[PDB]
Design a protein around this ligand. Structure first.
Ligand SMILES: [Cl-]
Ligand SMILES: [Cl-]
Ligand code: NA
Ligand code: NA
Ligand code: NA
Length: 291
């Protein structure tokens, strides 16, 4: 069965409830069941074919609230179902999946900038706290490489960060690694062909279009081709060997641009436009819905 790029939530004037899924072959955007609660600054991931929306914040004209929620979308039913929530609300969260468990990393709750990390077990619908990061990180990018969890960049409440650190699940321990060339908060971070990519973000002066890639073998970050559009708070995912970046904010506009990175040619190209511009979406890939 074919797989689609799902985008959940996001922000434009207020937090959004949209769930839409892009088909890179036929170009369509499918409109699917709304999130129960509008949320921006959330993360998406997929475990066992189910799409999970984690954390975020409901910015609404009636009031704003960070979210601890975990919700699960089933493409086979086009229905959302709530899960047990996290221990704390986490706006501008990063997540990664290791051995079928969801790791929720960093984020903010009001003025609290989290270094804490917690792990979700779907088979028991339970969260448990694990060792905290060495650094408080909101707008942190998260990727998993060889069953290690990497936390990249972010904002500690005062400084934006180029530092990255690595979580060893069986040691329950974080270790600093080589820092990125570029300070980035709200970057898109993902894994492609055994490398971690960090694309875009904000360094406290400019939104960024540069992209760099970490090689665990050489413990080095290297720049690759930059994106066409500078963007912070972008969504990112991998589909059939290519990176997709969705939306974001460029200092002036909430973007609807979607760009696609081909690693074999080291080229970015714009492939579609979202039905409306937005930042702060959660993005992941899974099977197309049934009908
Ligand atoms: Cl609507
Ligand atoms: Cl995401
Ligand atoms: Na994610
Ligand atoms: Na809202
Ligand atoms: Na940012």
């Amino acid at each position: 069965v074919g797989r689609l790029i799902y985008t959940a939530g996001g922000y434009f004037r207020q937090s959004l409830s949209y769930l839409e899924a892009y088909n890179p072959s036929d170009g369509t955007w499918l409109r699917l069941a709304d999130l129960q609660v509008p949320r921006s600054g959330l993360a998406g991931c997929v475990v066992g074919g189910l799409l999970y929306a984690v954390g975020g914040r409901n910015n609404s004209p009636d009031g704003n609230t960070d979210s601890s929620a975990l919700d699960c979308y089933n493409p086979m039913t086009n229905q959302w179902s709530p899960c047990a929530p996290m221990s704390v609300p986490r706006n501008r969260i990063g997540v990664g999946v290791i051995d079928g468990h969801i790791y929720a990393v960093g984020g903010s709750h009001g003025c609290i900038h989290h270094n804490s990390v917690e792990r979700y077990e779907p088979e028991r619908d339970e969260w448990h706290l694990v060792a905290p990061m060495l650094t408080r990180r909101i707008g942190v990018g998260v990727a998993v490489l060889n069953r290690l969890l990497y936390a990249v960049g972010g904002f500690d409440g005062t400084n934006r960060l180029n530092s990255a650190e690595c979580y060893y699940p069986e040691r329950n321990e974080w270790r600093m690694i080589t820092a990125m060339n570029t300070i980035r908060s709200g970057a898109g971070v993902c894994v492609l062909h055994n490398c971690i990519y960090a694309a875009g973000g904000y360094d406290g002066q400019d939104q960024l279009n540069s992209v760099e890639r970490y090689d665990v073998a050489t413990a080095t970050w290297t720049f690759v081709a930059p994106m066409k559009h500078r963007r912070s708070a972008l969504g990112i995912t991998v589909h059939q060997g290519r990176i997709y970046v969705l939306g974001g904010y460029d200092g002036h506009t909430f973007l609807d641009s979607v760009e696609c990175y081909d690693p074999d040619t080291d080229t970015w190209s714009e492939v579609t436009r979202m039905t409306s511009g937005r930042s702060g979406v959660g993005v992941a890939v899974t099977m197309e819905p049934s009908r």
